Amino acid sequence: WELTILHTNDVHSRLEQTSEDSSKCVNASRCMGGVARLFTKVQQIRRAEPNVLLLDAGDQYQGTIWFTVYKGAEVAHFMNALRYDAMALGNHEFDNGVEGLIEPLLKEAKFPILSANIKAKGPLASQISGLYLPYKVLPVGDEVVGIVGYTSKETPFLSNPGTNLVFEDEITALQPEVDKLKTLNVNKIIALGHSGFEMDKLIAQKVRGVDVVVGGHSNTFLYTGNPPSKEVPAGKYPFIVTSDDGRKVPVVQAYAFGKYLGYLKIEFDERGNVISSHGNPILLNSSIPEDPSIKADINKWRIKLDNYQELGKTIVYLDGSSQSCRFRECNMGNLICDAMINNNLRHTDEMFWNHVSMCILNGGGIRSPIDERNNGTITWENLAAVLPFGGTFDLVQLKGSTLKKAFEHSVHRYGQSTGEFLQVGGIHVVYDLSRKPGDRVVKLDVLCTKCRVPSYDPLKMDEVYKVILPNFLANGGDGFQMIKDELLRHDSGDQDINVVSTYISKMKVIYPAVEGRIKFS
């Protein structure tokens, strides 16, 4: 008995086809992904194979004006049109609160939405009862397949799920559900979830009875053979984990932004044991036509969006890709920090903040690049994809020791494409990744403020510094608990996207460089 698992993750509101790097489509012959093209490929496979599941591992929410405007209604609509079979909740599904998850998505989805490790408490429990499930048993041909869901333990620090939801440890929360399925004589079991590649492998190894893990969150690209595009494989597809109970468990993920369709064929015996698995993500390039009906529907909904005028011009590529901004100095990060600093200084009235020259900004907050080849034009739509969260750029007062700890946290688990990696302004930092976590920062110089000419001086642990940063970080987002607990003063500031669009309008032509604000030894 063969099962074909088709899988997406971290689509992040890329409803329309995109440029190769997931930014707006311009030359529609090199464009990729989009829901209309996805439909075609799914349809082709459904024509060919008898036992097909189409799964999503979370993070449909957030990423373009589609989501800014339709708030998830577009998600339920097009996922329904694609006839997804199940979805696990990702952290970004909680970005508009539970209220923004229940109403546009949980009420409208025609397929089960899953997470076994999220527990409701207080009044919310009976409100959201049954709207998402820990698992679902799905008929596939004459067989059934159990699908069990999970969501990153870190979600309260990543998104806005509120205080009435408890996020338990994935493995602990999963094992009883998998056991219940086994007592129900479900012998084929897929764990579908949004915790990242490292947790996916742990689940494969530790949760007895799981046959396949379909993951997301870390935007992991896996591939067997020579890759068809710019993404560099982190490992083979599928990635085989040897479980503690001695089984070979395939672990898959499919990058992000709808660029690829995950495709894994599993051979089971009649008792539900995996005999073999093989596949590869399918590049959704222009060789696959966009489905006319879906496309027409897309064009219909695209009308309301067209509103989003030219803000200014860039003469350089604005690299706001996660592969850059979560790993090293990226010019989009520099631009945003420079904008934060610039906008604030143009408030010369407020005396306590009018020399602030230091900025930090989590790479996880930077959600898209902007391409320069379209006459360099930058529009509100382009920018809303970079900064979709509607946050503010705030001022805080911090001890040197706090900042040093923040920079340690920035790389404490480097290599997993997590969001806490810091972009900067008025700061020169050097990391040595070979040293133990907590001790990786080997140089940290900052612009002096009590000096008539700004220059770089070593940060002192017992001095106090003034820093501009996203409110998300001021509130301890991405696990910067030291900032929230230790800050000395916190004033709220201007709206993030307005700050950057203003700066671009003032500057007229921008050209941020990679300058060596951040180095590695």
Add this chain to the structure above:
Amino acid sequence: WELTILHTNDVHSRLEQTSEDSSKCVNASRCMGGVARLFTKVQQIRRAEPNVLLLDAGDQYQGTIWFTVYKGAEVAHFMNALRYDAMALGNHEFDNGVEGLIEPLLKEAKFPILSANIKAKGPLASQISGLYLPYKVLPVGDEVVGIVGYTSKETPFLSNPGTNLVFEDEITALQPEVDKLKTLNVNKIIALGHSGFEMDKLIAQKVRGVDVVVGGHSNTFLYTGNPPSKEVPAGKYPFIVTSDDGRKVPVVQAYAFGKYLGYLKIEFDERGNVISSHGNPILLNSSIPEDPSIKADINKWRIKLDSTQELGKTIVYLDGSSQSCRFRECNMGNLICDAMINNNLRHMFWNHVSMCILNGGGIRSPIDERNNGTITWENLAAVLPFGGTFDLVQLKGSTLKKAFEHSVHRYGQSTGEFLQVGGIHVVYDLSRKPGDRVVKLDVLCTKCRVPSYDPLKMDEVYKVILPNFLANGGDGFQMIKDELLRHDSGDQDINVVSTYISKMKVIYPAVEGRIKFS
């Protein structure tokens, strides 16, 4: 027989009293220099000492809107009022060409103007004949003293003297003039000139018959004891040179910008041999009152000068002092280079240009931030007085590396070649041999979607924005003039910086590490 030598050099249009750093006076209680205050001090000395000479060692011209508007007439007028006894020509005296010097300095000065190593060729010769002299014999009491003048032979690459003036070696041109004075039995000789401290010491050493050297050009502060202000002494005052004759020859200079009055007392014997000398520059601070009469004349002329509206605000000290910009990265240089780049980018072969060089010698004043941050046209005019343009050139890598070597080839003499930059990270090792001091030179890539710094390559070609002065080989940058591959003239220098300050509204250039030393 005791002679009192009072001396100024490199006043550079500081006619009005100034802030301590030579920029515009704001809080008059803490201000310094200016001709009114100088007059008071000179007068206190003349009234107390029998044998006084007041000498200037050049570079009166250029530095504030006084010179922009009056073009030298203010120099002749106020030097006449102070009754200078002699002046040597400096390089900046040629900024407005020979016509800018003949009229109105040489025609209107009531004192001799000197330079023995400047020779006029062709038709200019008869036109300039006698308007400046190689030497002058001055009666002082019952005695005479000879003064011989000299002017940096680098003047053609620093200023605009034209093709009809020849600038000979100072030492070779001085010796026969000094010999002529000996023939006339003048036994007390002062060399007064504008070539810098190093040349002044060479003159003291090798020109037989010179008793005292009074210099300028390098803005050298010399002092004996604890200095009265921020300037750090480069040596004792006077600086003693041992000549090739075995004689001790005092060498003096008095910083710049009219901040100090040089004061040297010298004891001569009957045969015009220096027995001893002592003194010190006198700090012209607020303990010395401005002469009411000179002040009133200054206040009268000042009317035609009233700048004006605020261009924008700075929240940082804009360090355009020579002690910074000719020695290390200074934030005024960063500001000007970033403005050069910014203006060009928003206003096509050059539309990606990200590299800038600017000689520190073109940066003529700082701007103080403590005046409610305000920046006026007057402030800016003091920083960029030359009316040049910011041009675009195309240069081989090898040329650029040569330029950066030249930049530090004689580091330490406060000369103008030292380069401020944009889009470039340079590292110097000053312990290495001249011509091999550049140990790291990274520049912003051009053929790239995202700008980053990469090592400069000799064989590659770069586009750079820089002053027309450098494109033309000013400051000895011959390699740029001779080797460049394309040169397009650009916008007016002060206009570029003004509009940038205006567009940015609030500025805050930092010292970032664009230039480092090993």
